[PDB]
């Protein structure tokens, strides 16, 4: 099931910069999964009181009910779902694959049209996700970032008693102005009890939305149906591609980008020949624990859209077109589709 | 950085850095027109510091060494008149937290004493420029995508005294790079970065932060920035400065004009963004940008030569040979300006709003050149147009056959007016 969350106005998922008296500026980033997870958990917990403390996982860092991930969406004539653009797509909408030249002992990941390329910023339609997993990126399956939302800026000032500007009472913030008929959508595991309609306050500065529960669309069911074909193709080729739809915390004790083969062994892969990780800058993030009313430990996460190219010996045994990764999985982290490269 | 802002040359030539230096007791002052004012400011500073020293040492909160060194460690912000509105404001500007009727009288005496000084040399400037310059993708030249044919690297005419086939081959194939050539290029870069940049900056009375290879970062007074940014662009393009080699390549610049109040982190981020935008728009350009304390951010990306056209127009305006009212009418008419009308409209406006003579014609020609030299940022195939804009005369021909061919002009004029407005400020 999904939760269509049309925002009333701009929202602010603040960056971890402190809001000091002198440091009175703020900037918004793309919404992290943990914020939406916390919002949904609070919405369920408050309505049903303390009797659902175990389900909400009160105090604990993880709940019991499952949240898969969050995609963006819009209503361009139809309810369209969009995900982050993978880092392996060039501006010319051309895929990028490794071309390891064993003669020189290198593993260059150069594209098919040169050894230099820059990732295509934007979003990939969920309808085209199957084609991308099959390495057949179309031309009308992607849209840029500015067509969905544009960042806006605001100022604020706290007045003194009568009419003058109070000392140390000036601030400036920056928020996300979603375009018309373009909001967020949280993907929740089926079976979790939730109210149908209402409102929910997400993010800082006390901003709300108009959340509405909806069943899964046709795109996800189509992907699930074709997953078996994708899986047998991957088994035949021996070259499996992993694409990340949400940030992941794949690091072991001490966060790191080294994809440990132990997680890969659980999917049926026996021997991992090689791993080629292409990503971007790490994401540093820490939340605000309500129970202790204190900031959470900082965590570094692989940015969304990173691609892992793996050549393997064995068979993939998953019956689902996606696989969870890392820790804090229930919050919606580490959602990764698998395709053929 | 307020020191850099005050480093700008005043009308008399005695920049406020020297004036503050005497107050700090570090350097002498050559001029003696307001020597009594200097003594009044020094006495006011010493009395205020001593009075503050008595109170601060009374609780012994701040270390005594800081109080002792406060004679020469007084912040240059005290030289700003607005900072001396009240005793609390002066205490905060000095740095020590406020959390004194006699000091109130002292502030009044200091304010009156500083009034005479500010009446002659003017208020201490509170604006400065941040400049970051980067090399124009040296990886392309190192790979050999920018080198010329091998004929440009023979001795004089050896191609004549060789076989026809070898001559033909050397006529077409672009020369690659050998380790000796790479070492030569690296030494040339060192010569530019070490032996030329610090001297050029010291000529411009600026401050150099980090000059590593082809990366330059400087904080400059507003009075001499656009000159220095031009001069460096020439030094990076010279091939033989006498017997000393130079890189002889192109570079991309980013310049920001800001008041001394904005946070350093935001200023650095904005300047980096401006440099990146200049690089993206086609390189070989500078993204000038002015951000006032109010919030207005006027930005424009131009070639380095167009700074000369802007300088010519600004000199025309400051000399009052042409009234500074044509700018606003032209800005209003820009959104309804096309190629077919612009020249006639500009000529008519220059005739109407000047003192006639050849000044109107000269202004019109300089405006035409400046509007020609502007990098437009459209949507779609901006790479082709921007490359032609940085190319030269091909911009006029390509734009003639261009599809849009209107929006490019609409944005070119608006950009050229924007930095003209910036330069006319100083």
């Amino acid at each position: 099931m999904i939760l269509v969350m049309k925002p009333y106005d701009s929202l602010l998922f603040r960056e971890p910069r402190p809001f000091d008296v002198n440091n009175h500026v703020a900037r918004t980033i793309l919404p992290l999964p943990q914020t939406l997870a916390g919002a949904v958990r609070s919405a369920i917990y408050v309505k049903y009181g303390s009797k659902v403390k175990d389900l909400i996982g009160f105090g604990k860092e993880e709940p019991e009910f499952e949240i898969l991930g969050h995609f963006f969406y819009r209503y361009d004539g139809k309810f369209e779902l969009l995900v982050e653009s993978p880092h392996d797509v060039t501006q010319n909408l051309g895929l990028v694959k490794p071309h390891r030249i064993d003669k020189l002992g290198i593993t260059i990941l150069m594209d098919s049209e040169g050894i230099k390329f820059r990732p295509f910023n934007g979003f990939l339609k969920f309808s085209g996700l199957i084609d991308y997993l099959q390495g057949r990126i179309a031309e009308d399956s992607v849209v840029e970032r500015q067509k969905i939302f544009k960042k806006e800026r605001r100022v604020g000032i706290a007045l003194t008693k009568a009419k003058v500007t109070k000392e140390e009472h000036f601030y400036q913030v920056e928020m996300l102005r979603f375009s018309d008929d373009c909001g967020i959508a949280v993907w929740v595991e089926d079976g979790v009890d939730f109210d149908d309609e209402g409102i929910l306050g997400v993010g800082g500065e006390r901003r709300f939305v108009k959340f509405e529960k909806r069943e899964e669309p046709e795109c996800i069911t189509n992907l699930r149906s074709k997953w078996k074909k994708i899986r047998d193709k991957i088994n035949e080729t021996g070259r499996l591609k992993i694409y990340l739809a949400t940030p992941a915390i794949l690091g072991a004790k001490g966060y790191s980008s080294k994809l440990d083969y132990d997680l890969l062994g659980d999917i049926g892969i026996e021997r991992v020949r090689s791993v080629n990780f292409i990503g971007g800058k790490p994401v540093i993030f820490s939340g605000w624990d309500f129970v202790t009313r204190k900031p959470k430990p900082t965590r570094y996460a692989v940015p969304a859209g990173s691609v892992y190219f793996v050549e393997f010996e064995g068979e993939v045994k998953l019956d689902m077109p996606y696989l969870k990764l890392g820790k804090l999985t229930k919050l919606g982290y580490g959602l990764c589709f698998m395709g053929v490269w | 950085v307020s020191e850099v802002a005050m480093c700008r040359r005043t009308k008399h030539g005695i920049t406020w850095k020297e004036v503050y230096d005497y107050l700090r007791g570090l350097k002498n002052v050559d001029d003696e027109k307001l020597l009594g004012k200097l003594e009044n400011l020094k006495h006011s500073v010493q009395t205020l510091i001593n009075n503050v020293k008595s109170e601060l040492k009374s609780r012994k909160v701040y270390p005594e060494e800081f109080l002792e060194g406060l004679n020469r460690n007084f912040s240059n912000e005290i030289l700003y008149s607005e900072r001396l509105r009240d005793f609390n404001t002066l205490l905060d500007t000095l740095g020590f937290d406020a959390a004194v009727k006699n000091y109130e009288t002292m502030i009044s005496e200091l304010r009156e004493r500083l009034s005479e000084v500010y009446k002659m040399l003017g208020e201490p400037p509170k604006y400065y420029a941040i400049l970051m310059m980067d090399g124009d993708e040296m990886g392309k030249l190192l790979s050999g995508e920018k080198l010329k044919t091998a004929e440009h690297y023979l001795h004089s005419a050896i191609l004549e005294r060789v076989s026809d086939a070898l001559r033909v081959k050397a006529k077409t194939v672009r020369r690659l790079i050998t380790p000796a050539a790479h070492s030569s290029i690296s030494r040339a870069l060192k010569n530019f970065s070490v032996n030329h940049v610090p001297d050029v900056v010291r000529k411009g009375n600026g401050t150099l932060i980090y000059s590593g290879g082809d990366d330059v970062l400087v904080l400059l007074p507003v009075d001499t920035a656009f000159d220095v940014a031009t001069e460096l662009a020439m030094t990076f393009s010279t091939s033989w400065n006498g017997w000393e080699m130079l890189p002889g390549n192109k570079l991309s610049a980013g310049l920001l004009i800001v008041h001394y109040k904005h946070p350093l982190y935001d200023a650095l981020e904005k300047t980096r963004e401006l440099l990146q935008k200049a690089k993206k728009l086609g390189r070989n350009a500078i993204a000038v940008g002015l951000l006032k304390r109010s919030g207005s951010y006027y930005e424009s990306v131009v070639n380095f030569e167009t700074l000369e056209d802007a300088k010519a127009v600004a000199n025309l305006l400051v000399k009052e040979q042409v009234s500074p009212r044509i700018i606003y009418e032209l800005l209003n008419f820009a959104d309804v300006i096309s190629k077919e009308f612009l020249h006639q409209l500009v000529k008519y406006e220059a005739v109407r709003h000047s003192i006639d003579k050849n000044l109107a014609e000269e202004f019109q020609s300089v405006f035409a050149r400046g509007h020609q030299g502007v990098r437009v940022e459209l949507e779609g195939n901006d790479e082709e147009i921007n490359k032609y804009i940085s190319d030269g005369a091909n911009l006029e021909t390509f734009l003639d056959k261009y599809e849009k061919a209107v929006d490019v002009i609409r944005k070119q004029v608006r950009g050229f007016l924007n930095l003209v407005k910036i330069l006319y400020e100083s």
Binding site: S42, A43, G156, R177, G198, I199, F208 | -
Partner: protein, 338 residues
């Protein structure tokens, strides 16, 4: 805590408003579209100040009673009542009911949270000079669609079955040279309207106008801010999206101002600038989300969402407010109807 109910506010301007933003001093605008907007922060500040002044003056109709804030202070604060009363008088704190409704003061803000969240006010009608009949109230289908969806939030919470039927009928498509308007703005003879300098033609589909009027009738009452509803109904025009966008971009007033030095008697150096003003008679609305009072041991008669909603509706019905700066020169007066 969570948010349960959603009230609707209606701001009608009678003097130009200058809710300043970050032309040298423009008015706040949206980024995606460009319509004039008033940020929720300004409304929250204005409402908080008005509520604080009213409660300190003891004129609050809390369930039709005289709210003695000092008397009720000891009921909840008990021992700490004297300190809170002193701090409130020292401006370091706020009156108890205001703290409960809007939130704790900026000093002790980490203890509890407010129970109201004000949204950005969005425009609904824009006055534009017309050839026949003055200042036609113009609007666009995009604004209609946003209103229809937005109201669906509050009405559904209110279980307003009758209103929801009318909402679904708000469907219209307009070309750039087409408009639907009442008979007052229509020129006699030729079926055209001359809004500003454009010669838009009439589409002759007035069914939409009445439904729009009925929504206003139910939301704000038949007494339309001291005006007969018929006069406003007869002079409403709806045009395409782009025409309305251009109107919101340009029709706002621009005023140039100066400062004259006493010596000599002419403009001093650095003494000229420009300002932008929203026109008067500009219909506008805003939604406020109200939740359960997060305060602990709150005084009785204010304990549920319905109680707070009724208190707000009573206090802020048919009132007068000043929004934004330039109050000293008679800018910002607005009539508020819930």
């Amino acid at each position: 805590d969570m948010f349960e109910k959603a009230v609707v506010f209606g701001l009608y301007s009678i003097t130009p408003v200058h809710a300043g933003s970050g032309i040298d001093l423009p008015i706040q605008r949206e980024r995606h579209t460009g319509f004039p907007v008033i940020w929720g922060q300004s409304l929250k500040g204005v409402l908080r100040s008005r509520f604080r002044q009213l409660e300190l003056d003891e004129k609050i109709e809390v369930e039709s009673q005289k709210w003695k804030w000092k008397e009720k202070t000891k009921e909840v604060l008990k021992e700490k009542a004297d300190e809170f009363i002193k701090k409130v008088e020292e401006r370091k704190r706020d009156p108890l009911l205001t703290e409960i409704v809007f939130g704790p003061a900026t000093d002790g803000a980490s203890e509890h949270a407010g129970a109201v969240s004000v949204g950005d006010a969005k425009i609904l009608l824009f006055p534009v000079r017309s050839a026949k009949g003055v200042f036609a109230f113009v609007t666009s289908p995009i604004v209609i669609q946003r209103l229809k969806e937005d109201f669906e939030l509050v009405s559904e919470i209110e279980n307003d079955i009758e209103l929801k039927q009318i909402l679904s009928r708000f469907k219209v498509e307009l070309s750039n040279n087409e408009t639907i308007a009442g008979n007052a703005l229509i020129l006699n003879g030729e079926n055209k309207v001359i809004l500003e300098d454009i010669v838009l033609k009439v589409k002759s589909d007035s069914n939409v106008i009445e439904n729009l009027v009925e929504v206003l009738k139910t939301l704000f009452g038949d007494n339309f801010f001291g005006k007969p509803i018929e006069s406003i109904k007869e002079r409403i025009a709806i045009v395409s999206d782009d025409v309305f966008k251009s109107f919101t971009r340009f029709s706002t007033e621009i005023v140039a101002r100066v400062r004259i030095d006493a010596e000599k008697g002419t403009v001093a150096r650095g003494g000229l600038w420009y300002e932008e003003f929203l026109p008067s008679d500009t219909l506008m609305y805003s939604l406020i989300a109200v939740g359960s009072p997060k305060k602990e041991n709150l005084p009785k008669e204010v304990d549920n969402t319905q109680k707070i909603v009724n208190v707000l509706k009573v206090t802020f019905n048919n009132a007068f407010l000043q929004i934004g700066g330039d109050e000293t020169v008679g800018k910002g007066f607005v009539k508020v109807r819930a």
